[PDB]
Design a protein around this nucleic acid. Structure first.
Ligand SMILES: [Mg+2]
Ligand SMILES: [Mg+2]
Ligand SMILES: [Mg+2]
Ligand SMILES: [Mg+2]
Ligand SMILES: [Mg+2]
Ligand SMILES: [Mg+2]
Ligand SMILES: [Mg+2]
Ligand SMILES: [Mg+2]
Ligand SMILES: [Mg+2]
Ligand SMILES: [Mg+2]
Ligand SMILES: [Mg+2]
Ligand SMILES: [Mg+2]
Ligand SMILES: [Mg+2]
Ligand SMILES: [Mg+2]
Ligand SMILES: [Mg+2]
Ligand SMILES: [Mg+2]
Ligand SMILES: [Mg+2]
Ligand SMILES: [Mg+2]
Ligand SMILES: [Mg+2]
Ligand SMILES: [Mg+2]
Ligand SMILES: [Mg+2]
Ligand SMILES: [Mg+2]
Ligand SMILES: [Mg+2]
Ligand SMILES: [Mg+2]
Ligand SMILES: [Mg+2]
Ligand SMILES: [Mg+2]
Ligand SMILES: [Mg+2]
Ligand SMILES: [Mg+2]
Ligand SMILES: [Mg+2]
Ligand SMILES: [Mg+2]
Ligand SMILES: [Mg+2]
Ligand SMILES: [Mg+2]
Ligand SMILES: [Mg+2]
Ligand SMILES: [Mg+2]
Ligand SMILES: [Mg+2]
Ligand SMILES: [Mg+2]
Ligand SMILES: [Mg+2]
Ligand SMILES: [Mg+2]
Ligand SMILES: [Zn+2]
Lengths: 63, 202, 102, 157
RNA sequence: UGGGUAUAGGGGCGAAAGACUAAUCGAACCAUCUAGUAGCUGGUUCCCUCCGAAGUUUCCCUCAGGAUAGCUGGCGCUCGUCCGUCGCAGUUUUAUCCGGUAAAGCGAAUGAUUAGAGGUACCUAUUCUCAAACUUUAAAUGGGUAAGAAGCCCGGCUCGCUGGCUUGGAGCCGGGCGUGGAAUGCGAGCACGCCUAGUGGGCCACUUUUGGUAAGCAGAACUGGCGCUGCGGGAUGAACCGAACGCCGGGUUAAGGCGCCCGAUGCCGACGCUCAUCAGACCCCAGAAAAGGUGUUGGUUG
RNA sequence: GAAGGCCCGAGGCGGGUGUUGACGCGAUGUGAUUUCUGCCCAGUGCUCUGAGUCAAAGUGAAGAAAUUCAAUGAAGCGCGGGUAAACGGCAAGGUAGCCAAAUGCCUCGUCAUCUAAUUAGUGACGCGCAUGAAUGGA
RNA sequence: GAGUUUGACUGGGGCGGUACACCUGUCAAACCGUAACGCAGGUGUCCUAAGGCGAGCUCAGGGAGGACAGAAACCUCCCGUGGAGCAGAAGGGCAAAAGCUCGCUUGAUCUUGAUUUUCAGUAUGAAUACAGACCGUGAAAGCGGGGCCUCACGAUCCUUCUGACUUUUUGGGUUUUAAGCAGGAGGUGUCAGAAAAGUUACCACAGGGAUAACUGGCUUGUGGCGGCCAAGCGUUCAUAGCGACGUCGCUUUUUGAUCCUUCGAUGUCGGCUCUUCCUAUCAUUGUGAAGCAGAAUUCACCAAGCGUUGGAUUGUUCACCC
RNA sequence: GCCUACGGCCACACCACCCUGAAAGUGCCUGAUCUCGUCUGAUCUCAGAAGCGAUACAGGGUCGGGCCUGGUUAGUACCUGGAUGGGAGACCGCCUGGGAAUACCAGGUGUCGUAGGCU
């Protein structure tokens, strides 16, 4: 009472039945798996980014 | 053995005698050159081939039988030393045979014989001899066609003997020291080597 | 497999590399009053026969050698199990191998 | 059934080219890979560490993470009907900068230069690439000599 | 041999046949537990509209079955919905990568292998024939990425990372710049949302391909098809050719046909070939080979 | 040899054999007579002896106690002997017999006889696939 | 005496094998993937270094040499792209390396998360790239958290060990004990992991043509039958009659292969009986051929109209004999 | 023209042999007190400057081998898609596009960057 072992015959039709969908490209992709030492300093760059907010307003006025 | 109708078509990949295909028996054909092999190139100018027309497998049994059928006629019609037959098909493809039949459980068979895969337009057997023996080669190669399956046609090559140069240019290249005979064939001498070899020739 | 009796590995309580005395780990006798042993005895009491499976189809021919490390510092004396790959022959004392010999 | 080994079937894929064996040239390690650039993936058998899988050989992705002599690539991998953005970590010996990305960044630098140079002159130049158009009309001089007559040759053996 | 008694169901009794114990015996009969369980058969009741499969992946004391992924349907919802712009693609183009198959090669490596020649069994230069688990080479088809505003440009800010030095790097802020920065088609998005039935026995064909002498054989790749599908054609027939379907009228075709059955050549069709005392008569496709003929008709070289 | 063998029985000062007592009862094998009944006690089984393992209870020791440890340590096993008209085999290598058998694969064995003709029958031959001595032989 | 069990895959089943968990080459048709009881092999290990680092060194083999010493001992020089070695199968990689040798060592250590591969994109196993400690090594740059890469391994429950702490031990407190947290190990090879001997012809039920035995169907290896070529046989003479080495067919009266039909059943061997059919003609009718003198016989042709018997043995078809 | 130190590409650079080489440089060369390392100052490390271009090194030569490039083989082999094409089959032709590789022949034979230095 043997049967069939492996088949990929009708699988291409099933895959394209709803179409092969790529993940929607999102701005600001996820930062998972990045260097932890790099992520530490990048958090500190955003943590103290408001410290130079007064210099930003002064330099924008020169333009 | 089984009839050649069972192993006539090139149905499988080439299965040579290698470290993986062990236990292969010895082929039926062992001698491929007959007649006066150690003859000069000028001895046998004319050459005739047995060109195939099928993409099939010629058994080593049929290669040996057609070798004898062609040799026994060139000896009787051109003498024992007036020709040089060269069989240009070595049986390398091994045939497999299943056991004397639990039926197909483990059906991969053991080696049975050896065939030579021939192509459409490939030479099977070549005979070189004198020019006046042209009709004898055609008949010798015709009698050996019945020892082969499929369809074969007899062709008289334009080359000079077993060489790869045309007969019209062969005389000119000999005078210009571009071809020198070494036994059954000739060596092509280009002008792209050390000049010391050129001085040795002249 | 031959490992020395002395290692200089990281000591967790000391927080740094320390000389350790390497031994081999033994199972030790099972406590007759373990929770899984107390309920196994109560379940086996009475009629009914064997209530837990009895493993029969053993396949492993070796065991993972467990090394009982121990820092030689008299103040710490902390142990740590260090398991190595499976091996048939395992020796702790042994002797260093020599290349050019007969 | 086949085996699920990591390097199963990579006899010629990860092998070195003919007469290209030996130590890896140094410029392969001197190329800068910033975050977001398009790089190709091609496993090198000389260095077994940080080797990409056989499915990513010949694939292309953008770099998201950069470490010491190793980068992280976001590669697309179509499994059945879902293309998956795979975050793999391969060393720099197995990657090369995609020249297709560099050729596009050069077209932007020229497009921004042409539309700026055309504005200063008032002219309007084209920037969109157009496919090969049908060939325009043209005269063909015979040069006095007639065209060479051709005919099928007879069959020879 | 009658009658009266004895032995009662895992028991009785048996000169032993698993015999016999009320037509029931290799464990009687009766009622109940009991509507015992069944991955196994059988059946499963009105109409219509719309959408519409799967026999494949992984795991399972699984392989007549489930779980899971896929395919399905329903319910929506977030938007768009003149040009324009987002967004999308079983497709091309451009740009740039990937591969080691066909073919080729072995006077190149590994392996196999034929014949002479030269110099002194080897050695040199040649030569014949090969590889699926060989290869210097190497396609066709095929795979990946890219073809902009999530950009470009100018000027600053943050950092505890980096450091000869704003030196990097990344993040952030302000300002300026559509010719949207290949062709074509097209509405998309919500981990293609949420719940979800059926299926998890497939089979067939072109090409590729494995075992097998071969098989209406067994086993794969790809695409289509059958199954789920009627219709025209192949006399006929699940798969072939054409073409897919609400109910009709007119017209025109496909594949295939047009002596008659049988709609259409009831053309003053064209040119040849062929006589068969087993003629021949067209995809799949349903009987032929090697080898022969001073049958006949062409052609080639002498 | 009855305080028993055997067996019934949920249970008793239960019951059967037994209104019995070894010329008895119970359990098996072989199967009249005649004639023989060979070898193997290793294995399995039964049975018979007195020098490692060995439960609960009991004794000893440590500990606040639970607990732990130690010594002692039944039957049975293990060790040893006997036993094959015990299972069996031929540890012993099939003895006496018998046979191509209701038992012989090759096989329609070979030979003689029986018929015009015989894969049948009988008498012989026996390295007998795979006969054989109370799993009884003749 | 009672209860239960006595794996699965499988060209039926059993036996065999493990194609049941893994690895290499190939199949595989140039991304990946891709089946069969496809092909050729490997695995349940080994290693205190064969791990890590630094330094120096260069291998296989060959030539020429050198007391014993030779085809192979050791010394020297030259050539030597690796033709050696790298624990193992294979593939890949590798030369002032990854090989060989030497001296310092334990990154085979303590941790958090992410990622790759088999993947459902779960787990395990095995890998990748960081980060925080603590170290090794080198002058240093660096390199190293096992083996050059691809295999070399194991859930819940339970036991055991290690470690930690405002952790529990139930009205509080102390000490035992027990429990818990965290990390190892003890193992399930049917390897995502029940605890498992048969027999049944005395058999039973549910089913299955998913699946065997009997017919038919495809196939013709085998069996049977028939050509072609002509070495040779035929005293001489290849083809009167034959036909080696080869080769092409046919048949479905052998067997095999397959498993398409039938398991809510197609009665199944032979004989007897009886009819019709086929020709690959044994005899008879009409011919051709001979190594046809006659006779007898052989080959071939038109040809199935007619006939093909009686018995011993065997259930036998099949043989054998009268 | 040239030479060093560090290189990138890694034979057009390699290999064999022959010829030539200013100046500096490099190398050879001369020693073993110290540093350091060997069985041995050969190698290695150190110290030095009498000697030359022998070799290394560089340049050139060879109808040189190899390598590189191109031609040829060749629109050949192979191949996408298509047909109620041929053929008993094996296979082959055509349509639509794509398109090789040996032998053979020819040409070429290092180049570039940084720093310092010599004619
Ligand atoms: Mg299935
Ligand atoms: Mg399977
Ligand atoms: Mg009890
Ligand atoms: Mg494999
Ligand atoms: Mg009575
Ligand atoms: Mg009852
Ligand atoms: Mg019975
Ligand atoms: Mg509808
Ligand atoms: Mg389907
Ligand atoms: Mg069913
Ligand atoms: Mg479902
Ligand atoms: Mg399901
Ligand atoms: Mg089903
Ligand atoms: Mg099939
Ligand atoms: Mg089938
Ligand atoms: Mg169905
Ligand atoms: Mg459909
Ligand atoms: Mg028809
Ligand atoms: Mg109409
Ligand atoms: Mg019609
Ligand atoms: Mg004839
Ligand atoms: Mg007895
Ligand atoms: Mg005994
Ligand atoms: Mg006897
Ligand atoms: Mg009789
Ligand atoms: Mg007798
Ligand atoms: Mg006896
Ligand atoms: Mg039962
Ligand atoms: Mg089974
Ligand atoms: Mg592939
Ligand atoms: Mg670290
Ligand atoms: Mg069936
Ligand atoms: Mg036959
Ligand atoms: Mg023959
Ligand atoms: Mg006839
Ligand atoms: Mg009779
Ligand atoms: Mg040259
Ligand atoms: Mg070329
Ligand atoms: Zn410590």
């Amino acid at each position: 009472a043997k049967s069939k072992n492996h088949t990929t015959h009708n699988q291409s039709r099933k895959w394209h039945r709803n179409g092969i969908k790529k993940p929607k490209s999102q701005r600001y992709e996820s930062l998972k798996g990045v260097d932890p030492k790099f992520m530490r300093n990048m958090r500190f760059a955003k943590k103290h980014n408001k410290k130079g907010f007064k210099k930003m307003l002064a330099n924008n006025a020169k333009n | 053995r089984r009839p050649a109708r069972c192993y006539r078509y090139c149905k499988n990949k080439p299965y040579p005698k290698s470290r993986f295909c062990r236990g292969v028996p010895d082929p039926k054909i062992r001698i491929f050159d007959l007649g006066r092999k150690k003859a000069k190139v000028d001895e046998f100018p004319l050459c005739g081939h047995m060109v195939s027309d099928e993409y099939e497998q010629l058994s080593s049994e049929a290669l040996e039988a057609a070798r004898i059928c062609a040799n026994k006629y060139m000896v009787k019609s051109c003498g024992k030393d007036g020709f040089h037959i060269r069989v240009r098909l070595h049986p390398f493809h091994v045939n497999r045979i299943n056991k004397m039949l639990t039926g197909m459980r483990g059906a991969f068979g053991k080696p049975q014989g050896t065939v030579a895969r021939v192509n459409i337009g490939q030479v099977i057997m070549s005979i070189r001899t004198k020019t006046q023996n042209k009709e004898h080669v055609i008949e010798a190669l015709r009698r050996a066609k019945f020892k082969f399956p499929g369809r074969q046609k007899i062709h008289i090559s334009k080359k000079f003997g077993f060489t790869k140069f045309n007969a019209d240019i062969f005389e000119s290249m000999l005078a210009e020291k571009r071809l020198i005979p070494d036994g059954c064939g000739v060596k092509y001498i280009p002008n792209r080597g050390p000049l010391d070899k050129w001085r040795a020739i002249h | 497999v031959n490992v020395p009796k002395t290692r200089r590995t990281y000591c967790k309580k000391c927080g740094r590399h320390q000389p350790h005395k390497v031994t081999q780990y033994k199972k030790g006798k099972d406590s007759l009053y373990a929770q899984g042993k107390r309920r196994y005895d109560r379940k086996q009491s009475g009629y009914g026969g064997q209530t837990k499976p009895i493993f029969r189809k053993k396949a492993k021919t070796t065991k993972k050698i467990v090394l009982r490390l121990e820092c030689v510092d008299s103040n710490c004396r902390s142990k740590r199990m260090l398991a190595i790959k499976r091996c048939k022959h395992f020796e702790l004392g042994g002797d260093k191998k020599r290349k050019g010999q007969v | 059934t086949n085996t699920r080994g990591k390097r199963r079937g990579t006899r010629y894929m990860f092998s070195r080219p003919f007469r290209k064996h030996g130590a890896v040239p140094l410029s392969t390690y001197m190329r800068i890979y910033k975050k977001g650039d398009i790089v190709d993936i091609k496993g090198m058998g000389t260095i077994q560490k940080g080797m990409p899988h056989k499915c990513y050989h010949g694939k292309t992705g953008r770099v998201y993470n950069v470490t010491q002599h190793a980068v992280g690539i976001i590669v697309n991998k179509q499994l059945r009907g879902q293309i998956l953005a795979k975050r793999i970590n391969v060393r720099v010996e197995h990657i090369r900068h995609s020249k297709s990305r560099d050729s596009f960044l050069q077209r932007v630098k020229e497009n921004e230069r042409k539309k700026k140079e055309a504005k200063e002159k008032g002219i309007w130049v084209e920037l969109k690439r157009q496919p090969a158009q049908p060939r325009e009309a043209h005269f063909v001089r015979t040069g006095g000599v007639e065209p060479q007559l051709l005919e099928p040759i007879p069959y020879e053996f």
